[PDB]
Amino acid sequence: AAQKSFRIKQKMAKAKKQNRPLPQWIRLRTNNTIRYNAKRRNWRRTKMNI
């Protein structure tokens, strides 16, 4: 890093949008079943493997 390829900037940027908690309004829909976000990620817990 520190001087990256646009391919990698993307995945990096895509991964930044996926790093939010559940939108709580979803919690309210009929039959809704998703308690929490089970696909979250931390920079110092799981590495992206590029």
Added chain:
Amino acid sequence: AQRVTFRRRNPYNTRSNKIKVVKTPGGILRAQHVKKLATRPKCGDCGSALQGISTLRPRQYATVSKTHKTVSRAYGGSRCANCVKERIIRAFLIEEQKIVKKVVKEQTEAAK
């Protein structure tokens, strides 16, 4: 006491990464990157730095009035003049001897 950092992302000490510490109007020390040095062009005959000709890294010779890249003589910016001297002398003399070689063996054929 005042120390200093490279100004480019390259962190290693190479020929294209030479530094030069400098005092700015700000009163601070600062690195300045220094282009590699120019070397003098040379005689393609004797081999010396050929005098009268200016010296700058090659592409910089295209940003320069034509006089900086020449001297005003036969074979000007290209051979060292004592070289030109030589190849004039040898030219004359060998062209002359050519005459002495011809008419002499023009006699051989007639006296044989």
Added chain:
Amino acid sequence: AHAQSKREGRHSGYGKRKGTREARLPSQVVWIRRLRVLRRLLAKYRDAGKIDKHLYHVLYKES
């Protein structure tokens, strides 16, 4: 205050001396000075005629 006292030949005895004589002042450095100075004297006396060339040239090679 100290450095001054140094200037007066102080604190320079065998006791306060940890590097060798050579390291403190390289033999060669001493030489090169001396010879540069003999050399430079000759050129003076000769550049004035105080001494002639034939004598100079002997001194040079002797120096």
Added chain:
Amino acid sequence: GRVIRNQRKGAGSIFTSHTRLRQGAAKLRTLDYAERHGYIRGIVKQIVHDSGRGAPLAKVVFRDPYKYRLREEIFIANEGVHTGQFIYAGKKASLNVGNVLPLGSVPEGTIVSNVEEKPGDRGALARASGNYVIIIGHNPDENKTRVRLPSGAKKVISSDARGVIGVIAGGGRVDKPLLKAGRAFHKYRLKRNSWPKTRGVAMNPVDHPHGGGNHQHIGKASTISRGAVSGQKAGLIAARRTGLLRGSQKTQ
């Protein structure tokens, strides 16, 4: 067992020549019209060091007679040849050190180097720091010429085959003790990866015909047949005699 060392060198991986610094390949001029009906002049613009070579190369430039332009060849410098010198290449060319002549035209006794095997293979015989060949006779009908090589082996090649007058430079190179490991180190540095050499006797059986045992010993005869198969041939291959050479050498 493991593939033994000498087998591995053929697949040429970490073995291949160290090529990079080398003036180019040394060669005679192509065998054109000029050089086989007359002769042609050029100047040695430079004699220089080839890397991994014993003998100095010789940059020698000529005119191209079929286009206005210079064409430079690369010669191995015979002894005593010098920059600025004129060099002659051709059947009808005078016989002084440095010139290249067909072996048909040199009186016997002539000493020559970098000689062609077939004519026009641009040099191929005695090119090494010191060596040369001696023309020991001619046979006009079926124009052959007989020469002695540096090996002492006598050979007969065609007379049109060229070779150059004189001996190769760098004489006596092998006379100086290498002296230490580093010198050979730097010797082979610019040749190929063949040094240092472990002894097959110091390895285990997996590694070599000689390997293993509770003492270091070849354990069977080290003179190995010609017909011997890959992975067997290590030691004195095809050895017809063996032991310290008593008495004079020199091919009778």
Added chain:
Amino acid sequence: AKRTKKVGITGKYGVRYGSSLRRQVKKLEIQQHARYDCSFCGKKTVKRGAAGIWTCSCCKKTVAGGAYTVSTAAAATVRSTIRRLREMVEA
């Protein structure tokens, strides 16, 4: 004042390699570093530069020569043999 009874330039090698070997080198080293007479301009300015190559300080001529010395004994006989043989061809 004489510094070494015998080892000469070979005195760099200290105690190593064995006397005999130092001798063989020394002989050849004295040959290679030595300064030589120029056939062309006549000053003793020919000095070596990598095995085989001999070049004049001034006048800048370069001769190809022996590995450690300028003229191989061999080569020089060869110079003469060719002399001889050449001569026959004109006369």
Added chain:
Amino acid sequence: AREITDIKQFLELTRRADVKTATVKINKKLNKAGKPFRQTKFKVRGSSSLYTLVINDAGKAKKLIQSLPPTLKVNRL
């Protein structure tokens, strides 16, 4: 980036087609050793270089400032 001294060449600069604006500068300085004196630099700005003409004489400056084209944009100090 360029210095000028010809007080005729100067004038013509200030009438060049591309020379839009210019500025006049005033430093107190000192003379030889004894005393001070008022210096004045006449900077003209071309499309690719700032020519500046130092006039060390107070008198010459007062007359020069009037020679300036009235269509020129002068920045005083």
Added chain:
RNA sequence: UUCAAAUGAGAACUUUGAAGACUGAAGUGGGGAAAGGUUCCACGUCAACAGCAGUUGGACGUGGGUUAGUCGAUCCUAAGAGAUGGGGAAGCUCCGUUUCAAAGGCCUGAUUUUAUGCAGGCCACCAUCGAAAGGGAAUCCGGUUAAGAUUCCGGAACCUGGAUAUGGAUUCUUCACGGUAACGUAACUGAAUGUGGAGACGUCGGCGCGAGCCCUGGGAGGAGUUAUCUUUUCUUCUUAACAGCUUAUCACCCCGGAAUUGGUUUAUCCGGAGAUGGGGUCUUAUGGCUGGAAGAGGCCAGCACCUUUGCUGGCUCCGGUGCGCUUGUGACGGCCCGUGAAAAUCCACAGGAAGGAAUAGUUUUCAUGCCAGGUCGUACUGAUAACCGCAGCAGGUCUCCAAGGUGAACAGCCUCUAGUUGAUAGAAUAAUGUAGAUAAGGGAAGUCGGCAAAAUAGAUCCGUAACUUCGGGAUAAGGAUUGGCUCUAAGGGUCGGGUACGAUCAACUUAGAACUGGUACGGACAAGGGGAAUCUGACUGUCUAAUUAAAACAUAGCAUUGCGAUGGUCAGAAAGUGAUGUUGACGCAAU
């Protein structure tokens, strides 16, 4: 580590002030490469997480933030990789990379149906990928942000492409003059084709000079100490790219003609192939003064007021020193069976096809002028918490910058600047520990074994054996000396001398002599135990990462073998296939 304040339900742990310390410029400072990917910054904020805690965080929630013609990429080529005409292979695919190939595109001319067919002449180079440390067009300084900056703001530049118009230069001797010459210059035409240079190159050594740093005098400022003493201690006093003029060791030219040989480096080279001498010519590394540019920056004092925050004055000057340190660089010298890349790219010259003036032509390598410069990366960590080791792991992980003292020193030890003060805490100090020490008399009696420990140590002088490959053995061994202070002597630079000496300036070295002390003084730090033999390996060098470092491997040296290419040796399933081979017996291969 400590005291206090503030904050908060709550404070050993957060913020702030104070105190004590630490890292000590080979950093716990300032930045980067790889790797991470938002951790960067702000606000909110503690359920989990940070092996005590928590009001704090690299955690949680929510947002904000990475600006380029000039920095990189992009282009170039390196080892190598790899399509294609081919040839192998049942086939996936293997070979080959210019090789058994009909391999392709530039300049302007021919058009004035017209847009671009043919007319010359070339040129045979025949993919492409491969470097964010190699090659390479061009930018700096000041200011600015919560967080960006050689990227924004401000000022000043430069490069490349494209357009071109005025000025100048040039020509009736058409394609300039000048200089004896080296060569000068604001210019001063030049197709094909050829040729030359630059790109472009090892390492060590001393010596010369540059820059930054270090040291230091005077003056102008601000600060510190002042029982006492000190014209004191500390600190500010700066000048970018770019441009003009000027500046060089080297090299070369002109004059002249050398034994009584001279010139000359620290280092012994130079000259009748023209020295010493005199006079000139060039390279512009580097430096000087001016432009930039004092308006900036830096230091102060003197007025204003919730504010944005101003407003007004000043000063920013002159020098010294050198085996200093770091780096840059030149002229040289040593070394080699080692002689220490390539291409893109830029210029020059040889050539002279051609085009071009007097009623007006040629000229854009002189000046000035106009338009344009895309795409992607730009945050931050770089480590005793941002990377890899299951982790905020005593491990690992490529590099630049570098102050004062002591000392030989980039050592150790103390300090300035900057940064830390993180590592659960409290009370006691039993046994046994781990780590650090001392011990009367004896001195290895301990033990497999002096294991461990002790002893030694710097520097100056004196003194030094067998043996030896004559180079060593050697710091052999053995000795003496060493502080403080006070003096003496030796060692240098710069100037004017008709064609003997005078005058001043600035240095630590080295030897000596007094006095002095609870006989101490390399006073901490730092720093070799020696000796006589046997065995074994010659030596330096190498290995079992994680129980073996050795006498084992290597080595030079010695010797033996194979081979002249239709070949030795070795690779492959094959082959119009491959290593040795850019090779040739002073060689390659095999012991």
Added chain:
RNA sequence: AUGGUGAACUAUGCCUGAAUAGGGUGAAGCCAGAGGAAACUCUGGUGGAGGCUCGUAGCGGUUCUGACGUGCAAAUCGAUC
């Protein structure tokens, strides 16, 4: 047994880069001088040689058969080297 994936560790070659305080020794070459009938021999300097030596960084890994041995660590830590 068949078919696949690895040289981010490590082994070795190539290509292109980068890195190493201060000391001791004093090899060729060079200058001046001394003796000697001669042949030749000596002294003082200068100079800076080496897979040389003292020793940091670096690289390594000898001993304590030291620490640790449910570790900081699936190889580390200390001193010594």
